[PDB]
Design a protein around this ligand. Sequence first.
Ligand code: T1C
Ligand code: CL
Ligand code: CL
Ligand code: CL
Ligand code: CL
Ligand code: CL
Ligand code: CL
Ligand code: CL
Ligand code: CL
Ligand code: MG
Lengths: 207, 197
Amino acid sequence: SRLNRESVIDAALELLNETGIDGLTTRKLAQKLGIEQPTLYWHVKNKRALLDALAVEILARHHDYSLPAAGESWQSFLRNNAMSFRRALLRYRDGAKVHLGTRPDEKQYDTVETQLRFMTENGFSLRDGLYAISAVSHFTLGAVLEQQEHTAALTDRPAAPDENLPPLLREALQIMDSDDGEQAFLHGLESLIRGFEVQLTALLQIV
Amino acid sequence: SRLNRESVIDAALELLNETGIDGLTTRKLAQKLGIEQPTLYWHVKNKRALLDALAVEILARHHDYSLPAAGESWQSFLRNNAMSFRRALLRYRDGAKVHLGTRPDEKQYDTVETQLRFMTENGFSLRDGLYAISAVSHFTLGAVLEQQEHTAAPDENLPPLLREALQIMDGEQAFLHGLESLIRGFEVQLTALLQIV
Ligand SMILES: C[NH+](C)c1cc(NC(=O)CNC(C)(C)C)c(O)c2c1C[C@H]1C[C@H]3[C@H]([NH+](C)C)C(O)=C(C(N)=O)C(=O)[C@@]3(O)C(O)=C1C2=O
Ligand SMILES: [Cl-]
Ligand SMILES: [Cl-]
Ligand SMILES: [Cl-]
Ligand SMILES: [Cl-]
Ligand SMILES: [Cl-]
Ligand SMILES: [Cl-]
Ligand SMILES: [Cl-]
Ligand SMILES: [Cl-]
Ligand SMILES: [Mg+2]
């Protein structure tokens, strides 16, 4: 089949949904594209290069709330940015593990620069704007990684000692399972953003 | 060598520091222990069983602030608990990737039950206590993974605000700042009760 950049990525994302990150191999990708491995090699050197391209392409295609809307509050921006980030990472199997394995490229540095300019124009110190951006990223990535690695584990581990659970824990585990963690995520997000606001709002006052 | 639980985990943690999570295999573990693969299999069925056990044992050995002190505020407990969790995850190479996706083990049940009892005895609903505990976990995991990996915000080419931000600064600062933000947000939510907030 065609081996333009776009088609190679389309097949690689299809393979990633089939195999997950550990099972994705250039051999399987060649077979899916109907080509020999040395043909694929001309197009993409190794699994590392493929995963780096997939991470960038997952965000470029599906993380579309990178930049604040005209006159958007910093609160609303961080919220929409986090939801778009989570949604992009959840779109492919082990998508967060794909994102984790890559260094930010020139385009990701430009995006953080725009975000940091925005935060500082909204009254954040440089340090505090970057800590807010990093905290939202760390929280969102951890939430998604815990959700996808729980699903990956479900292959080799059944569910564990039911009979044994103490009662708050048992009820808690039932609540988190009702919705695969969207509620936990959205609640935690509001907490994080409000915390940033209380800190910013103090200015130089002890808080 | 000895193949009790403790010695298999010691060897596996030594291997993990050598190879990282992707490179840790039952075959390389058998080699490290000086045994044949079918000998190891009797003790350890597969990599998932090994990783699950390492997640538990890393906290048992290195997570020292599982429980609130007598009379400690919930804020202080979440802060001390998160620092201790971060410290345990950083103790071994790819420690946060070893933790990812695990669930509380039966040997952690009493500990996690005490955490939830404590939050609810401090005024959190079960849901709100649980979301605080989950958000602290997920944030700490994110922060450590981005530190063990190198995943977030060439020197000539950095854009200028980012470059100045990096110049006026190993993850701990951003982590501790984010932790205080999360704790304050929990407190605003708890204090609001039924008020529009
Ligand atoms: C909130 N409780 C009910 C809970 C639930 C899950 N897992 C899930 O909800 C699984 N959710 C799916 C199945 C993806 C829908 C959880 O996965 C967890 C926890 C508890 C935490 C407690 C963490 C705690 N610290 C960091 C806040 C802690 O100190 C310990 C400890 N001393 O052993 C933990 O075990 C903890 O770090 C931890 O790992 C938890 C969970 O994994
Ligand atoms: Cl072609
Ligand atoms: Cl193309
Ligand atoms: Cl390869
Ligand atoms: Cl972003
Ligand atoms: Cl033995
Ligand atoms: Cl033992
Ligand atoms: Cl295995
Ligand atoms: Cl300079
Ligand atoms: Mg856990």
